[PDB]
Design a protein around this ligand. Structure first.
Ligand SMILES: [Mg+2]
Ligand SMILES: [Mg+2]
Ligand SMILES: [Mg+2]
Ligand SMILES: [Mg+2]
Ligand SMILES: [Mg+2]
Ligand SMILES: [Mg+2]
Ligand SMILES: [Mg+2]
Ligand SMILES: [Mg+2]
Ligand SMILES: [Mg+2]
Ligand SMILES: [Mg+2]
Ligand SMILES: [Mg+2]
Ligand SMILES: [Mg+2]
Ligand SMILES: [Mg+2]
Ligand SMILES: [Mg+2]
Ligand SMILES: [Mg+2]
Ligand SMILES: [Mg+2]
Ligand SMILES: [Mg+2]
Ligand SMILES: [Mg+2]
Ligand SMILES: [Mg+2]
Ligand SMILES: [Mg+2]
Ligand SMILES: [Mg+2]
Ligand SMILES: [Mg+2]
Ligand SMILES: [Zn+2]
Lengths: 50, 46, 93
RNA sequence: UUUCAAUGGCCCGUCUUGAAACACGGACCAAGGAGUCUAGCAUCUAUGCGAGUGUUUGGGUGAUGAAAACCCAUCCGCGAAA
RNA sequence: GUAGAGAUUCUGACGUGCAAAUCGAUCUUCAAAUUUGGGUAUAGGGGCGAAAGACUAAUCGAACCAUCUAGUAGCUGGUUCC
RNA sequence: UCUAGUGGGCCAUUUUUGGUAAGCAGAACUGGCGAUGCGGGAUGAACCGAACGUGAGGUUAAGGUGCCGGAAUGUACGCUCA
RNA sequence: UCUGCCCAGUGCUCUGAAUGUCAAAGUGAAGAAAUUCAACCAAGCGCGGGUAAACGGCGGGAGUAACUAUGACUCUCUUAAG
RNA sequence: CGAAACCACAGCCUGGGGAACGGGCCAGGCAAAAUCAGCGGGGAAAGAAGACCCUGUUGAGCUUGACUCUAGUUUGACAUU
RNA sequence: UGACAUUGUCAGGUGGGGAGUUUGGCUGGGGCGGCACAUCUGUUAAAAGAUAACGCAGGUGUCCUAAGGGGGACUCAUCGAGAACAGAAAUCUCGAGUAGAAUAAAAGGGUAAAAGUCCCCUUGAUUUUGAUUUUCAGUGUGAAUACAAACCAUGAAAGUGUGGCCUAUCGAUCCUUUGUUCCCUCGAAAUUUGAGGACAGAGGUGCCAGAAAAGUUACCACAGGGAUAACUGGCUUGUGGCAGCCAAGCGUUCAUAGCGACGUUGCUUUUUGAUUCUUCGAUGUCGGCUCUUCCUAUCAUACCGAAGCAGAAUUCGGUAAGCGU
């Protein structure tokens, strides 16, 4: 037999379509301020992520 | 067709053997309901 | 068939070249040594890749083996072998 | 030699029990086109020598001109015993 | 319904063709799972597949090129003068 | 002594078995064809006669002698009208 | 709008209480030693539980009706469920 | 102006026998130059070493609780320690 | 997180995901079936020997320590007549009794002071060699015959006995395994383990002169085969249909107006079948449409014959295929 579809999903045409994505969603690198106190940030944008 | 998939082929569209396949199946035979504890329509679960 | 446990027959042994009494038993194959050259050769051949390297009998029939009588001269310790026709049943004495 | 008359004459090759076959190949002509050479073995024949036989693994006349001819030692093969 | 994209029927034309797939009429779709240029990725037991064993340069139930290779053939054909 | 081809047969007479039967299948005996031309049976592998170097003459076999066609529209006695 | 019954079979899944078997390695004994003989061990395993919008099942076997076979008739097993 | 397929040799019928449906063989019917346009009876017309079937100690694609293996995977021993 | 894990090596399990390969023969095509694949008896078999079919009727791959070997004694299957007991010819007795019984299993052959039955003793169902017969290549295997050298059994003895009264009942190489010897070898020399040999057997190969082996292709390939099927011609007629002869009869009465059994002689078949002679380097395949021609086994049309008033209706009856259908 031939290589089944599930076995072909290893890269290539099955990679994620990521051109329209602005960045990974991440917490913030755990640093001194967060370990011991707090740090303030301001929400600049709320955006749709394709 | 059988060349394409373990489910392929036959003079009717049917699987042939059970679709619950073992956890330690090789790639290319690990298709269908993998290592299923049970199957069928559950009536009350937890 | 029924075969007496004792029979008086010619003894081919060098010290008793005459008719003497013998104790009769059925012959059974011995237990297949691992040191026999053919087994050493077969084991060496079977190692490595290539799979089964020699024929192996997958069937069996004709379970009527020829009965072989082992005749032991009572006093001389001399043993002789006698072959009988095939049969399904055997009993000594 | 051509032609006529009288009498006879089916299309070759092939496989086949059997081919003119409604079996296959063949439109025509030229040129090309298929049992070889080698390591063995067996019988038969010829030749040399014969209880022996085999100079060419080698070495020499050798340099002139030398892939030849010609010469020469020890082994060895086969044979002389099963 | 037009451009575009298709290809149902005539089982029409053609069928040593205009053409190794075309021509006419008819027909399907025509603002989206739409059509398409260029760039780019996936390569042969591999790819790619809204799945027909389809498609992968007129090649696909495993492409194309060279080599192993003068592959083997208990089979077909041939096998040359009196 | 060494070695080739062969290891699909087939036809007839006579003896047969199987089969409803068969231009059928299978055996027995001999003669044949295959490998056999020639005269005869209009025709025809096997039936009849006869087996073949190139020719002259003679005579035959099987079969013929109204014409085709070489050879008595011969002889004798009957039968027969379709 | 419904999605019935069946977990016996085959799959899947969870058990270590089976140590029940058992490789390699290691441990004990005999031997001069190769080695032999014994126990010991994992998983897999036999069991056991679950599982059908898993594969599937929701009757089967049978001997016998005028060529043979026959499914007429003759009978049961029914079983996981009928 | 100008191909091609195809082509053993060819080309009028009936009957016979015959590899059992002949253009050629045997017996008959017959038989007269050179040609044009059509036609679809025949040439068992052409095409393609039957694609059906069987045989071959010839394959391939596919399947599986066939035979023999194998990536992987799982468990143990030993080393890392 | 942590000396675990990972990694390396080896081991056990799992592993159509993947690889390689195999998946008998005969055969009235192949398949299915069967086994005619190793063998026996009667027949086919044509009075020597040989002789085929998936011809016919039957057997066999066992069984037996006696159902083998020797000796002795006796005679069987049946029939008849008596006695019992009570049908029962169970038993017992006497006559006749050529085997009509038995002899393991098929059939054929053989056998009567035995080869059958009973009894007594036994292990010749043993070791060794060559010769021979059958199948036959005059190879193997199987089976069998006559001897020889031993050792035995039995019998008073002559003798008989090397399995089964005769004709069937079975197995190479390699490997393993067993038996056997004051046996040979392990190649620098020894001893002891272990291994290897020579000789005689057994493991088992029934596809029986002896591979280790599942399917599918409705996607298919190649070499071929008319040695071989469907097709295609041709042949055959078991079926069926039709036509004669026979005349018991139906037909109030007259056996054949018209019907007409049991038999018997023919024709045809467009029926599948049978066979396998042509065709597998290829003869396009049903029906319909179209179109022509031929046959007659005549539906209609022409002319004729017989049964009863006409009228008709039947025998289309007899000629006859011109012309329609
Ligand atoms: Mg598959
Ligand atoms: Mg002529
Ligand atoms: Mg020939
Ligand atoms: Mg010819
Ligand atoms: Mg031919
Ligand atoms: Mg040919
Ligand atoms: Mg040609
Ligand atoms: Mg030339
Ligand atoms: Mg068209
Ligand atoms: Mg060549
Ligand atoms: Mg080649
Ligand atoms: Mg004349
Ligand atoms: Mg012709
Ligand atoms: Mg061909
Ligand atoms: Mg495979
Ligand atoms: Mg054989
Ligand atoms: Mg063989
Ligand atoms: Mg299909
Ligand atoms: Mg099919
Ligand atoms: Mg398909
Ligand atoms: Mg033929
Ligand atoms: Mg032929
Ligand atoms: Zn002794």
């Amino acid at each position: 037999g031939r290589v089944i579809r599930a076995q072909r999903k290893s890269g290539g045409i099955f990679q994620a379509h990521t051109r329209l994505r602005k960045g990974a969603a991440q917490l913030r690198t755990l640093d001194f301020a967060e370990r011991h106190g707090y740090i303030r940030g301001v929400v600049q944008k709320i955006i749709h992520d394709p | 067709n059988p060349v394409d998939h373990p489910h392929g082929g036959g003079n009717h569209q049917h699987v042939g053997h059970s679709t619950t396949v073992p956890r330690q199946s090789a790639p290319g035979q690990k298709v269908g309901l993998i290592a299923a504890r049970r199957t069928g329509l559950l009536r009350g679960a937890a | 068939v029924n075969i007496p446990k004792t029979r008086k027959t010619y003894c081919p042994g060098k010290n008793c070249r005459k008719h003497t009494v013998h104790r009769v038993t059925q012959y059974k194959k011995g237990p297949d040594s691992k040191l026999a050259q053919g087994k050493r050769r077969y084991d060496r051949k079977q190692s490595g890749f290539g799979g089964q390297t020699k024929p192996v009998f997958h069937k069996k029939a004709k379970v009527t083996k020829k009965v072989v009588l082992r005749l032991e001269c009572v006093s001389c310790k001399y043993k002789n072998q006698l072959v009988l026709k095939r049969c399904k049943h055997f009993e000594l004495g």
